[PDB]
Design a protein around this nucleic acid. Structure first.
Ligand SMILES: *[C@@H]1O[C@H](CO)[C@@H](O)[C@H](O)[C@H]1NC(C)=O
Length: 728
DNA sequence: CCTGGATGGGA
């Protein structure tokens, strides 16, 4: 009858996360479960018999059960994990242990990160010959401190003949552990105190695919958090350090205080696809160096935050990065962008992504991005661009350009010269105060998406955005305002499918009618539709002219009433309506006859005291009803009974003491969701709601533990299964 | 490596 795995939830996974458990649950048969998650409980002691009932486990997560500062120490009996002979993955992270427990040989992945284990020797990982993955980060650093440092004894890991991944970050290491297994494909030793590297440190590691050695010589300028500055001026790299790494696909040297590069570092890495040079002092290097000469397979290059301690121009060697797909140049702080600055990138055949934000650019010739071969995304957000030189997804597929958070006060169509192939643009969070009239975006003949939110557009002109013949989505949200009429242009936008006028300063001379044959989605939330629909018949047909409209969002409009007339005069094509977060107290549910094709209705966050008015009227096509976070106290029988297509209903965060089956009739059997959490259910031993929820248990989210009682006081705040309610 | 610009994940 009951779910078999109380107080946990069965996903062959069983989820016991965040249940304040102090011991491993014992729960018909527990011999078919293979995965158990106990994340962030209170288990502080583990014992030889704790997992005996879970003999066939393959995966075990115990993260955050006994967190070190920030105090907790975990005790583990010797035979604890041995009961699980087929155990493959074990996560022991964020637990105060000082030694690694005894483990079965079937182990494959192991996490020991953020513990108090300070020493790894040959005895620590005994019998783990099939171990492929070992993580142990953050055992000795400012958030999990230790006197001295973690010590990995030379050759301790050589028993792991199958090891591919090894991470030992934030451990205050001063050297790379010696004689590591040569089978390694991933080595991460970043953010220790390794101020010196050479071929000795990486000896015998010929199967390395990525290597992370960043943060070992940190500049700490404007560091928000406790940081250890490198004693020397820079990381010391022996010229032949990585020279024997013939499979190296990834190298990260971030925050290494590098002042110059050296071409010797890369000349052996003929598979190098990823290079992270961010957070060093290469401002002058990147402009002159020849190091990029033979990085032929290089796909990703991170140059971010290499700022000056002239005019920026990338080195000529960049023209050899024929495989380059992505370039990060954020936070470099060069105030001028021109035809030279990036010239050696233009002929690069596959360069699609260019990151150029947080650079304090106040002069930019955007035309240069029209000369590029395969550019798909250029981010110029958070800069100081103020004019011509002297919904965004758009993801992966559309020539997109982001000019968010700049200093545009006026749009002059000459700033878009050569950008005519742009399909998406964002000018949000500028300070554009300008009466749009149709002369601002002429070159943008192919623009499909335009984000102009958080500006100060005057929108009286009916010719607005008419020079954008392919415009499909327009975001004018959070726009702050004696001729024309507000929003008159919508009818003259032939292809507009999505529009947002959310949170706008609406004028008195706002148009009384919105029109379009193409608009399918309108966000009109955060406006004054309550004060507009109280003005009589003036705005009674405000939305009627949007023929074909499918989705309307009328959230946060301070609606206290919703007459049938206003409903009847919405487009008959409507399928989704959201009145979320209004002040609707009473509502005639039979008035949904006026929305014949309505499929989804969201009335969450209103004052619906009850569901009485009122009945879901046949033959509504309503599939989803959301009445969460009202203060519903009751519902009339057969309320949902006539909604033959009803699948989802959310009654959460109300104040029902029960949930009755007579509310639904035969419909409740087909419900896909029935969310009843956060209700003060009265858990008397008679209660029949438990018999109802149990009938549709799979369709009830958080049933096993998330649905709580509100009374009686001893069962309050506790699950409806805390005591067995079916006994009287 | 991914993520952000700091640090934690990871498999
Ligand atoms: C029901 O509404 C609440 C409101 O906060 C939300 O948290 C919850 O996710 C919703 N349930 C479903 C099934 O969407």
């Amino acid at each position: 009858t009951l779910p078999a795995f109380l107080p946990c939830e069965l996903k062959g996974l069983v989820d016991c996360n965040w249940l304040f458990l102090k011991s491993v649950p014992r729960f018909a048969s527990c011999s078919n479960i293979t995965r158990l998650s106990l994340i962030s409980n209170r288990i502080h002691h583990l014992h030889n018999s704790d997992f005996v009932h879970l003999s066939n486990l393959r995966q075990l997560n115990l993260k955050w059960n006994c967190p070190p500062t920030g105090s907790c120490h975990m005790t583990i009996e010797p035979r604890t994990f041995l009961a699980m002979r087929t155990l493959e993955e074990l996560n022991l992270s964020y637990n105060g242990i000082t030694t690694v427990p005894r483990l079965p040989s079937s182990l494959v992945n192991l996490s020991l990160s953020h513990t108090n284990i300070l020493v790894l020797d040959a005895n620590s990982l005994a019998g783990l010959y099939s171990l492929r993955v070992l993580f142990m980060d953050g055992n000795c650093y400012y958030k999990n401190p230790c006197t001295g440092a973690v010590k990995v004894t030379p050759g301790a890991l050589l028993g792991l003949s199958q090891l591919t991944h090894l991470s030992l970050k934030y451990n205050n290491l001063t050297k790379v552990p010696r004689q590591l297994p040569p089978s390694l494909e991933y080595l991460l030793v970043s953010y220790n105190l390794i101020v010196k590297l050479g071929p000795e440190d990486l000896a015998q590691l010929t199967s390395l695919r990525v290597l992370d050695v960043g943060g070992n010589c940190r500049r700490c300028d404007h560091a928000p958090n406790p940081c250890i500055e490198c004693g020397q001026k820079s990381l010391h790299l022996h010229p032949e350090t990585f020279h024997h790494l013939s499979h190296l696909e990834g190298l990260v040297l971030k925050d290494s205080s590098l002042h110059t590069l050296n071409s010797s570092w890369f000349q052996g890495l003929v598979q190098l696809s990823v290079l992270d040079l961010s957070e060093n002092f290469l401002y002058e290097s990147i402009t002159h160096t020849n190091a990029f000469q033979n990085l032929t397979r290089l796909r990703k290059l991170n140059l971010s935050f290499n700022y000056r301690k002239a005019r920026l121009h990338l080195a000529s060697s960049f023209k050899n990065l024929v495989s380059l797909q992505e370039l990060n140049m954020n936070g470099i702080f060069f105030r001028l962008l021109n035809k030279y600055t990036l010239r050696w990138l233009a002929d690069l055949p596959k360069l699609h992504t260019l990151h150029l934000q947080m650079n304090f650019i106040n002069q930019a010739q955007l035309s240069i991005f029209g000369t590029f071969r395969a550019l798909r995304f250029v981010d110029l957000s958070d800069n100081r661009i103020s004019g011509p030189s002297t919904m965004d997804r758009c993801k992966n597929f559309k020539f997109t350009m982001d000019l968010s958070r700049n200093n545009l006060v006026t749009i002059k169509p000459e700033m878009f010269v050569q950008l005519s192939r742009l399909q998406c643009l964002s000018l949000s969070h500028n300070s554009i105060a300008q009466a749009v009239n149709g002369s601002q975006f002429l070159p943008l003949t192919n623009l499909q998406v335009l984000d102009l939110s958080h500006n100060k557009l005057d929108l009286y002109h009916w010719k607005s955005f008419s020079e954008l013949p392919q415009l499909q989505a327009l975001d004018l949200s959070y726009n702050s305002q004696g001729i024309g009429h507000q929003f008159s242009f919508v009818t003259h936008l032939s292809m507009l499918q999505s529009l947002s006028l959310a949170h706008n300063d609406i004028h008195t001379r706002v148009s009384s009618h919105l029109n379009s044959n193409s608009v399918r989605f309108l966000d009109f939330s955060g406006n004054g539709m309550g004060r507009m629909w109280d003005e009589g018949g003036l705005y009674l047909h405000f939305f009627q002219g949007l023929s074909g409209l499918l989705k309307l969002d009328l959230s946060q409009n301070n609606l206290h009433i919703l007459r049938p007339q206003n409903l009847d005069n919405l487009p008959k094509s409507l399928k989704l309506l959201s009145l979320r977060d209004n002040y609707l107290s009473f509502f005639n549910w039979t008035s949904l006859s006026f929305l014949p094709n309505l499929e989804v209705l969201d009335l969450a966050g209103n004052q619906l005291k009850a569901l009485t008015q009122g009945t879901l009227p046949n033959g509504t096509l309503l599939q989803k009803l959301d009445v969460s976070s009202n203060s519903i106290v009751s519902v009339v029988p057969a309320f949902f009974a006539l909604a033959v297509e009803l699948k989802e209903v959310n009654l959460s965060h109300n104040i029902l003491k029960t949930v009755d089956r007579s509310w639904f009739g035969p419909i409740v059997m087909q419900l896909t969701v029935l969310d009843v959490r956060s209700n003060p259910l009265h858990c008397a031993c008679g209660a029949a709601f438990v018999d109802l929820l149990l009938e549709v248990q799979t369709k009830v989210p958080g049933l096993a533990n998330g649905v709580k009682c509100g009374s009686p006081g001893q069962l309050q705040g506790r699950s409806i299964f805390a005591q067995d309610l079916r006994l009287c």
